[PDB]
Amino acid sequence: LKDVVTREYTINLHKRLHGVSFKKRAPRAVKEIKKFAKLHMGTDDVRLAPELNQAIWKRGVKGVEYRLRLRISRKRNEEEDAKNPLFSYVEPVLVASAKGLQTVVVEED
Amino acid sequence: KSLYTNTSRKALEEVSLKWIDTASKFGKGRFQTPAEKHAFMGTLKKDL
RNA sequence: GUGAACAGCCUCUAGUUGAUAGAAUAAUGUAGAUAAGGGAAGUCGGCAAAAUAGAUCCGUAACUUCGGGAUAAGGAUUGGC
RNA sequence: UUUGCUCCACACAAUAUAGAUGGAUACGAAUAAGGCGUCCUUGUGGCGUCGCUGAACCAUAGCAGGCUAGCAACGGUGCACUUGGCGGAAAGGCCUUGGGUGCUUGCUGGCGAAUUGCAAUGUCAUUUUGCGUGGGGAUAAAUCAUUUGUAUACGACUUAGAUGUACAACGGGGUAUUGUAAGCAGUAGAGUAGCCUUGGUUACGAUCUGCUGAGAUUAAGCCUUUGUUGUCUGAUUUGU
Ligand SMILES: [Mg+2]
Ligand SMILES: [Mg+2]
Ligand SMILES: [Mg+2]
Ligand SMILES: [Mg+2]
Ligand SMILES: [Mg+2]
Ligand SMILES: [Mg+2]
Ligand SMILES: [Mg+2]
Ligand SMILES: [Mg+2]
Ligand SMILES: [Mg+2]
Ligand SMILES: [Mg+2]
Ligand SMILES: [Mg+2]
Ligand SMILES: [Mg+2]
């Protein structure tokens, strides 16, 4: 619960972005991925890799992929103030297709 | 139950159903049963 | 680049990414659209909107100051290889 | 719950009073008719009686009602108990049983009262609440936050959530939409350009054909789930 752990998930950005304004789809995808990481790792401090932001914006503001495969690593941080000592870091996995993949524990990184 | 005794020949009619639609309401449902769907469509690539 | 084109649309060099934001997606709006069948019955009034539209070929009336009217009207064709 | 809550009794405090100062004392119906009593032959009966207002009835004497002694009679009345019943229109009252106890002014005595100074409401009722002393009893919820979308401008509404026929994210299946994916192959292809063992071969070629009703998408307010992974005690407030 309050430990370090890395898991790989698939997020259904299609259903999360259904009906969203085109100029807001990619920013909405960023916020939905933050909500996803907060739901699965319980951290308010979610940090998105710039490579993940590139993957989100890869096809413009409206062309967000239907499914994104993310590696979410809940890691502990210790800094100026406590402020949610656990934070989650989200990176892309860079698989060929983000289809037919279940949540797995990484166990190595 | 009704609050009065309706006798209007629209009540008092004995209805016998001849058929009940069970095609999908999630679209323009074409088949009543998966068996009828398989019989119409023949063998598909996934199975059937 | 397309194209007749300094049109529209996309791109290079250069420049900017500046307009208070976040969350929802009721009514009524502003702006943009669609609509069965009918087709101006609406309305002071076809207002608004729709329809037409480029190019090539054919065809083109009354009237006329003989210069026009005229893209009259009305049709056909258009991609790729 | 920094010893909370509630019920009974008691004391002490406040708090006021739409206004106690003997008793709201129960048929129903009619009124050109009735009530009561009585009788029989039980009726729309006979007889008697009454009203002419409650000006009644009951209660009512005692230091705001003290302390005592008797007589008479087994009555009245307060009280706490106790027996059984009836009453739902708002019953929360009505009746009833037995014993105990107090008083009795039904009658006859004994003692007390004063000086509140010639009157001054001259304080006697009931309404809530609080606190303390004992005794009995009980041992939750709601809201925020998260979540749902049968809801929705915001509030509000409807849902779910402490270890499960739980919930969620994925994945699987069903359903549905479109219309046959990429890739590879072809003695398909209008033809065109080369080569020579001149019937083939190489190159270009919209397109066609096969794998392929394939591929893609499918809840975001679709249905379903023996799979995978995870989550499940944060905040505020509420007492008769
Ligand atoms: Mg929409
Ligand atoms: Mg339907
Ligand atoms: Mg040109
Ligand atoms: Mg129409
Ligand atoms: Mg029409
Ligand atoms: Mg017409
Ligand atoms: Mg008219
Ligand atoms: Mg008119
Ligand atoms: Mg007119
Ligand atoms: Mg106009
Ligand atoms: Mg013309
Ligand atoms: Mg003319």
Q: Does a structural domain hold residue A90?
A: yes
Cβ of A77 near strand C (under 7 Å)? The reply is: no
Q: Does a structural domain hold residue A94?
A: yes
Q: Cα B14 vs. chain centroid, distance in angstroms? A: 19
Alpha helices (H) in chain A, listed in sequence order: 13-17, 25-41, 50-56
Q: Does a structural domain hold residue A108?
A: no
- Residues spanned by the domain of A50: 8-98
Q: Does a structural domain hold residue A2?
A: no
Q: Does a structural domain hold residue A29?
A: yes
**Beta-carbon count within 10 A of B6 CB:** 10
Q: Does a structural domain hold residue A39?
A: yes
Dig out the tokens for B24 from the structure.
Answer: 């999908």
Q: Does a structural domain hold residue A109?
A: no
Calculate the angstrom distance between C1' of D36 and CA of A74. 103
Q: Which residues contact B5 (CB under 8 A, 6 or more apart)?
A: none
Distance between CA atoms of residues A30 and A24, nearest Å: 10
Q: Which nucleotide is nearest to A19 (CA to C1')?
A: D220
**Resolution of the coordinates in A?**
2.0
A100 CA distance to ligand 9 centroid (A)? 70
> What DSSP element (H or E) covers B40?
helix B34-41
Could you give the number of structural domains in chain A? Answer: 1
Calculate the angstrom distance between C1' of D212 and CA of A99. 21
Distance between CA atoms of residues A29 and A20, nearest Å: 10
Q: Does a structural domain hold residue A104?
A: no
